[PDB]
Design an enzyme around this catalytic site. Structure first.
Site, PDB file in Angstrom:
ATOM      1  N   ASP A 299     -12.733  84.774  71.088  1.00 29.36           N
ATOM      2  CA  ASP A 299     -12.234  83.543  70.491  1.00 29.36           C
ATOM      3  C   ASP A 299     -11.935  83.635  69.147  1.00 29.36           C
ATOM      4  O   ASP A 299     -12.738  83.850  68.211  1.00 29.36           O
ATOM      5  CB  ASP A 299     -13.114  82.333  70.583  1.00 29.36           C
ATOM      6  CG  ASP A 299     -12.826  80.973  70.725  1.00 29.36           C
ATOM      7  OD1 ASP A 299     -11.637  80.991  70.309  1.00 29.36           O
ATOM      8  OD2 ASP A 299     -13.399  80.187  70.998  1.00 29.36           O
TER       9      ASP A 299
ATOM     10  N   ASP B 168      -5.562  81.257  71.826  1.00 30.92           N
ATOM     11  CA  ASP B 168      -6.576  82.189  71.158  1.00 30.92           C
ATOM     12  C   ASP B 168      -7.897  82.368  71.813  1.00 30.92           C
ATOM     13  O   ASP B 168      -8.888  82.816  70.995  1.00 30.92           O
ATOM     14  CB  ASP B 168      -7.022  81.332  69.766  1.00 30.92           C
ATOM     15  CG  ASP B 168      -8.025  80.325  69.918  1.00 30.92           C
ATOM     16  OD1 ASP B 168      -7.863  79.709  71.127  1.00 30.92           O
ATOM     17  OD2 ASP B 168      -8.685  79.835  69.200  1.00 30.92           O
ATOM     18  N   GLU B 169      -7.735  82.460  73.067  1.00 31.24           N
ATOM     19  CA  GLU B 169      -9.142  82.761  73.866  1.00 31.24           C
ATOM     20  C   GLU B 169      -8.684  83.916  74.824  1.00 31.24           C
ATOM     21  O   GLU B 169      -7.402  83.835  75.396  1.00 31.24           O
ATOM     22  CB  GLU B 169      -9.649  81.600  74.350  1.00 31.24           C
ATOM     23  CG  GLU B 169     -10.055  80.490  74.004  1.00 31.24           C
ATOM     24  CD  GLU B 169     -10.719  79.400  75.168  1.00 31.24           C
ATOM     25  OE1 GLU B 169     -11.223  79.776  76.285  1.00 31.24           O
ATOM     26  OE2 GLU B 169     -10.324  78.129  74.702  1.00 31.24           O
TER      27      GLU B 169
HETATM   28  N1  LIG Z   1      -2.185  70.128  67.790  1.00 33.87           N
HETATM   29  C1  LIG Z   1      -3.216  70.521  68.063  1.00 33.87           C
HETATM   30  N2  LIG Z   1      -3.768  71.747  68.114  1.00 33.87           N
HETATM   31  C2  LIG Z   1      -5.163  72.140  68.463  1.00 33.87           C
HETATM   32  C3  LIG Z   1      -5.929  71.070  68.390  1.00 33.87           C
HETATM   33  N3  LIG Z   1      -7.321  71.578  68.730  1.00 33.87           N
HETATM   34  C4  LIG Z   1      -7.030  72.923  68.930  1.00 33.87           C
HETATM   35  N4  LIG Z   1      -5.627  73.249  68.421  1.00 33.87           N
HETATM   36  C5  LIG Z   1      -5.025  74.409  68.295  1.00 33.87           C
HETATM   37  C6  LIG Z   1      -5.503  75.120  66.821  1.00 33.87           C
HETATM   38  C7  LIG Z   1      -6.538  75.703  66.976  1.00 33.87           C
HETATM   39  O1  LIG Z   1      -6.814  76.618  65.975  1.00 33.87           O
HETATM   40  C8  LIG Z   1      -6.419  76.385  68.351  1.00 33.87           C
HETATM   41  C9  LIG Z   1      -7.710  76.940  68.708  1.00 33.87           C
HETATM   42  O2  LIG Z   1      -8.646  76.022  69.398  1.00 33.87           O
HETATM   43  P1  LIG Z   1     -10.337  75.790  68.862  1.00 33.87           P
HETATM   44  O3  LIG Z   1     -10.979  74.980  69.598  1.00 33.87           O
HETATM   45  O4  LIG Z   1     -10.836  77.173  69.073  1.00 33.87           O
HETATM   46  O5  LIG Z   1     -10.332  75.646  67.538  1.00 33.87           O
HETATM   47  P2  LIG Z   1     -10.173  76.619  66.252  1.00 33.87           P
HETATM   48  O6  LIG Z   1      -9.690  77.934  66.439  1.00 33.87           O
HETATM   49  O7  LIG Z   1      -9.344  76.152  65.295  1.00 33.87           O
HETATM   50  O8  LIG Z   1     -11.555  76.880  65.476  1.00 33.87           O
HETATM   51  P3  LIG Z   1     -12.908  77.211  66.187  1.00 33.87           P
HETATM   52  O9  LIG Z   1     -13.063  78.696  65.494  1.00 33.87           O
HETATM   53  O10 LIG Z   1     -12.861  77.407  67.616  1.00 33.87           O
HETATM   54  O11 LIG Z   1     -13.997  76.374  65.676  1.00 33.87           O
HETATM   55  O12 LIG Z   1      -5.854  75.420  68.902  1.00 33.87           O
HETATM   56  C10 LIG Z   1      -5.727  69.833  68.508  1.00 33.87           C
HETATM   57  O13 LIG Z   1      -6.604  68.770  68.869  1.00 33.87           O
HETATM   58  N5  LIG Z   1      -4.405  69.479  68.337  1.00 33.87           N
HETATM   59 CA   LIG Z   2     -11.084  79.776  68.033  1.00 33.28          CA
HETATM   60 CA   LIG Z   3     -11.008  78.263  71.811  1.00 29.11          CA
END
Ligand SMILES: Nc1nc2c(ncn2[C@H]2C[C@H](O)[C@@H](COP(=O)(O)OP(=O)(O)OP(=O)(O)O)O2)c(=O)[nH]1
Ligand SMILES: [Ca+2]
Ligand SMILES: [Ca+2]
Ligand SMILES: [Ca+2]
Ligand SMILES: [Ca+2]
Length: 341
Positions: A7, A105-106
């Site tokens: 991830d 990203d997974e």
């Molecule tokens: N437009 C939009 N994109 C999102 C949303 N949630 C996630 N994404 C996109 C941006 C994130 O960077 C990517 C990956 O999801 P993740 O749940 O793993 O969050 P993230 O990678 O940002 O942080 P993390 O390391 O998992 O805590 O998908 C959302 O509510 N809206």
């Molecule tokens: Ca992530």
């Molecule tokens: Ca993820």
DNA sequence: CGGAATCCTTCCCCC
DNA sequence: GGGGGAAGGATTC
């Protein structure tokens, strides 16, 4: 059965850091601006620096700004993130042919054959983390366990920049102890239906008659939670294929007039066709987000592939079906194409 | 805000 | 009764 899950950390924001390393250590907020008003829209994601003050995916940009007025605010550049993502997926392919690319990203890897045990798997994770950090400068979290769901939970526990093994001892502990909402596939709505049945951890799903459980959450989710609680979830890592391409845009004002909405609808079709790139769909759906954040749609499957002219013509008909059937104003309008030839 | 998969319910045609 | 498919929603990440 050893599954390794990758991830990528705070992905969109981390990519923006890689493309401008002077962003590092600053709070970075990747935004989707809707054009309705100054800073109308939402956070796609944020790095941890912004996150620890409550700036996270889903909040309005406006609210983010009042928590962190001095943060760096950047528009989402999805096309870029996608190209960086697929490069990282390509490196992961070098560690197994059994790869499931679950999102931007997974990914899950079946490393049952490249590795003997959890010690060797934990070392392969370190090899993998390091390889990605060296080649693309992206930190990731790795989760390792006996199936996909527990590899994923492992990553959630270790993040960010982590690596975690949930062996078989801990798997059994988690069935009794893990809050059931932290099970992947259990969102807010399902978490709350399960509370009503007094199911607060996985173990509870066995203490309840199946027909009741599927009465509440549906058959698939029922069988899913049961196998997990029974320590016999064992779904294969499977190569996934795109089934649908689409695009939805927000209108500057909420409207009900056909000719006000059309240019937005047509723009959505145009970008959708470019994304389609030599893929021919037999099915089209017009999707509308009404003023009360509700999602309405109308679709049509054809015996043949849909030409751009036909998409244009059909979409207007489906939008008209929407306005005839639903009294409310439209906030977002778009299309989805599927059933590829 | 945004893209997409999977699942659920209902309705349909028909053996 | 039930297979097979479409449509419109629901829900998740
Ligand atoms: N437009 C939009 N994109 C999102 C949303 N949630 C996630 N994404 C996109 C941006 C994130 O960077 C990517 C990956 O999801 P993740 O749940 O793993 O969050 P993230 O990678 O940002 O942080 P993390 O390391 O998992 O805590 O998908 C959302 O509510 N809206
Ligand atoms: Ca992530
Ligand atoms: Ca993820
Ligand atoms: Ca949850
Ligand atoms: Ca049936």
């Amino acid at each position: 059965m050893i599954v390794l899950f990758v991830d990528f950390d705070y992905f969109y924001a981390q990519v923006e850091e890689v493309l401008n390393p002077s962003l590092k250590g600053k709070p970075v907020v990747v935004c989707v601006f809707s054009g309705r008003f100054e800073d109308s829209g939402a956070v796609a994601t944020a790095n941890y620096e912004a996150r620890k003050f409550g700036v996270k995916a889903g909040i309005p940009i406006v609210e983010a700004k009042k928590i962190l007025p001095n943060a760096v605010y950047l528009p989402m550049r999805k096309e870029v993130y996608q190209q960086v993502s697929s490069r990282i997926m390509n490196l992961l392919r070098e560690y197994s042919e059994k790869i499931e690319i679950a999102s931007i990203d997974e990914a899950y890897l079946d490393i049952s054959d490249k590795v003997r045990d959890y010690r060797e798997a934990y070392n392969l994770g370190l090899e993998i983390k390091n390889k990605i950090l060296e080649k693309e400068k992206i930190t990731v979290t790795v989760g390792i366990s006996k199936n996909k769901v527990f590899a994923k939970i492992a990553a959630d526990m270790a993040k960010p920049n982590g690596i975690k093994v949930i062996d078989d001892e801990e798997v059994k502990r988690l069935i009794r102890e893990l809050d059931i909402a932290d099970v992947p596939g259990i969102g807010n709505i399902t978490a709350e239906k399960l509370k009503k049945l007094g199911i607060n951890k996985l173990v509870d799903t066995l203490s309840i008659e199946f027909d009741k459980l599927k009465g509440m959450i549906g058959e698939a989710k029922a069988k899913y939670l049961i196998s997990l609680a029974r320590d016999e979830y064992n779904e294969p890592i499977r190569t996934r294929v795109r089934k649908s391409i689409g695009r939805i845009v927000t209108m500057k004002r909420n409207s009900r007039n056909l000719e006000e909405i059309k240019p937005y609808l047509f723009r959505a079709i145009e970008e959708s066709y470019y994304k389609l790139d030599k893929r021919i769909p037999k099915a089209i759906h017009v999707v509308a987000v009404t003023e009360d954040l509700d999602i309405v749609s109308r679709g049509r499957t054809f015996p043949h592939g849909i030409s751009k002219e036909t998409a244009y013509s059909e979409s207007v008909k489906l939008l008209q079906k929407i306005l005839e059937e639903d009294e409310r104003k439209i906030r977002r309008i778009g299309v989805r194409f599927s059933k590829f030839i």
